[PDB]
């Protein structure tokens, strides 16, 4: 695919819509995330253009996947990232100097700095972007004012130059938000607040997933297939309120209500709808119709056709040669959902690259007894120490392509990264031979405030020398979201090889969380804190406390000190999220 | 359906496009003929509106088939006639006083009157509308100037008030044009002149039918299914030239070229595409999907769904329960035509009401021997005379719901219309009994210049007292088009009951045309003229010489005088087209 931009170039004619962006680089993000845009043309600040046309971001589509390039000064053009195998971010950390980004201003308070005003926007339910008047701003009245804004689109309605002011976006999509995510989904309930948009959805999960990526949507009501009024079946009503919460909880059958999870975006599927919808036909515009052997292959044909957004495989009785209908609409959704016409429908997987790789589905395997097997806990690594002899030293978790999360105390009297060897995808320690391949560590980042395990801060990152080619054997686990701080995890597991004594086959064990004060009562001498967590009723130093919640695995804890019944104490990973992100980029 | 307009009413929001029309009444025609418009809002001349918004005709669509009505002064709103069972005209005879209708001006010559300037526009290959500067127009230079115009749309690009000028449309769609229609369709031939538009068509007939109703299209090239370049299969290229003719005849296989038949519109199918296209899938936007027993019923489900423009029935092996896909696009055509996916496709018949009823298909029957049978020649009437006794007097042809075309000489010593009785749908004269129903004549319009049969002008209209409910038994025949003057008819027939001696069963006879000078040589004493035609090698006074050409029956002649081999002489109906239309409206 083509990621790089085009200096002084305009794509002639394929317009869908026009928005305002601070830069072409973010124009490209808008295009990538909009359901039809394939190419675009940003207009930079320039003498050769009037100020009203600056910051214009024209989203475009073409049947051929491209358009005519004509020369224009200060026109930056580009392609979307839909066509790409590399992952997709959505997080713009830029503070734009002298840029006044207009929207509906709704709070206007004082702030120490642009950084604090960004933290405020990010932590707010409504904020899309901010403008911060610096201390050098002439009007004393307006000096240090942090005004938060929102628009229909997430995009500013205008962009103008205004010296001594800095604008910037919300970092909710950088996993930096302290906002609580309400995952509670309310059956037989409707909400009646502001209806800002509507889509047709096959079910409420998809309805909620759509709410999450829609910038104006804070919560929703889905009117199900079995809903009485036919005109409203499969209707996903995207809603907002001035409070941020829904005004009232009206009971009603066959309807289903919930919240945006914008703040937990990085740990949830959002753009990745992988299910198939049986005896279901998605109505849209027809891209193509091809012979296909199964619904699964139909989805592939869609995924690999860039303009395709959803499909309906009509199965062949007769012979094995169904018809695969590749479809699209203006909004990524079907215009109508029919049941009872025998179709098998779903969506493009071309989207799942927009999702965090740690949210991809778990491969069904016969997790038998309490002995693990290949692929089962593929985030687990075994940390080897070359010195004295090559031996297992610690457990660790893949959380990145180049990053291991583990315990700081594992590195007591480790004088360089160069004695360390990280093995992935390992069942048996016995499997490890001299010829075996491993990742070498390049850097050990220990928390600068770490002293002792039983004190706080027992957390470490290994930056690997080479990156991991992800596989069923080797995959990352998600960090818990700062918004998920009150989630009650009830499916928690520890894994590792016993570390003293050690075992060969990777062991596994479902174990229960225990509350920080039920833990404190059973341990005195040093204080258990908010930055720790407990469980018990095993594994190694550095190993994961992995909790499964809503089909996704979370790295809730790192094994710190067992002391043993007295429960294991773990580093509370959630409390080190800023830190992990700060250090990893 | 709703035909009547709405005073001071605007339909809020469903905009497709915006054009300029002289009046709301013609706005309604534009809407009816545009492939998506269902409702609209015209803006009349008014103090309460600025002059730039006058004559605005906003074409609108709605998923529900209507929109919100809000009050506005000088906004006229209405619905299309798509929803209607009554026939549809397209012919606006209005001369708009003080109205300057802007377009590309291309000829600018002098003219005696507005009527003559309209006749000139009508007779011209390129003309959509005209403006005529009256003799009272101040600038002496511009006084009496008849300027012809065209636009992309057939619609003027602007409308402005300009005192002492009159504007008006072409009457090509009133069957008033003297322009020759080139029906010759050129196999393995392309044209290379100006490409003004393109559509996907299943075959070249449809391609040509689309050219005919497209105002900018004078001729076309169709690139067939078997065309080498896949990107251009089923491509219907709508073309024009400054000459009006195609520049050159480039040979090339699998391509097929032809002309607009705009001038012969009233005798040809144009909007009525009644065929089914097998192993053919029409791509468009999906309106609905329903269970259906056959392709024929699928077409019905489309026809009766007003937004549906075309369809694809996928047949059930298995059971009798296919899937009928109701579809639509922006232009009435499929966006792509796929072969080989097993679909049966075609178009809405909701269109055929736009076609002249005399173009509807002939019902297959076993036309046996030379004795007719029920339904065979359903335009034929038997003219009875009540006096002395009730007896067959003349043959006649239904050409309207309330009109019979026949011979002037039939009415020798007929003192009132009240002795006349018109019977339709009659095989046997014996079938006629006292209880039998008939149409009473209200008026006998004889050509004022008629003297004697063997002189000219032997033509008469019967205006009936009640109108004919059309049926397989009773249907009209088309007048020949003034543009079809050089058509060589080779499938001509006379029908009637022998009128002297007479027969009971309706007789039929294929007979050959004979040239006017091959006729003149075999008849002297009075002159055969351009306004007569001959045939021979039978029927009554007043009866039809019916010629079948391109699947359509034409009333080429009325039986005037046999004199018998010496051939029959007929009134040459083509030469009395202005007259028939003048008298019938
Ligand atoms: C605007 O936003 C700010 C911060 O999100 C709100 O300020 C807080 O108001 C509450 C209520 O007194 C206090 O407890 C907080 O200490 C305030 N914070 C700060 C930084 O002053 C403020 O109330 C909002 N006001 C409106 C309605 O615009
Ligand atoms: C404009 O249109 C008129 C009529 O359609 C053309 O006038 C005719 O020109 C030919 C060529 O000399 C004459 O034989 C006709 O007698 C003319 N008719 C009249 C009414 O004058 C005229 O040539 C066209 N001219 C252009 C190119 O604008
Ligand atoms: C556009 O710019 C390039 C780079 O200078 C030039 O070579 C080209 O001729 C320009 N215009 C075209 C191809 O129309
Ligand atoms: C490695 O694990 C497999 C799977 O259980 C086991 O059969 C085998 O015994 C182990 N290796 C050794 C040293 O036996
Ligand atoms: C629109 O006009 C009608 C006719 O006077 C009036 O009764 C009506 O109240 C007006 N407006 C509405 C219903 O919004
Ligand atoms: C009427 O026509 C039918 C059809 O040929 C014929 O059988 C019958 O003989 C006719 N009527 C009379 C008077 O026989
Ligand atoms: Cl400001
Ligand atoms: Cl559901
Ligand atoms: Cl398309
Ligand atoms: Cl494709
Ligand atoms: Cl989506
Ligand atoms: Cl003029
Ligand atoms: Cl063909
Ligand atoms: Cl639609
Ligand atoms: Cl419908
Ligand atoms: Cl059409």
Numbering used by the authors:
A (entry chain A), B (entry chain A): 2 to 317, 321 to 503, 508 to 545, 554 to 580, 585 to 605
Give passages from the manuscript.
The regulation of extracellular proteolysis is critical to blood hemostasis and innate immunity and proteases plasma prekallikrein (PK), and coagulation factors XII (FXII) and XI (FXI) act as master regulators of several cascades including coagulation, fibrinolysis, complement activation, and inflammation 1, 2, 3, 4. PK and FXI are homologous and share 58% amino acid sequence identity with the unique feature of four tandem repeats of 90 amino acid apple domains at the N‐terminus, which harbor exosites for substrates, cofactors, and receptors 18. Factor XI is a disulfide‐linked dimer whereas PK is a monomer 20, 21. Factor XIIa recognizes and cleaves both PK and FXI but it is unknown which of the apple domains is critical for these interactions or the molecular basis of the reciprocal cleavage of the FXII zymogen by PKa.
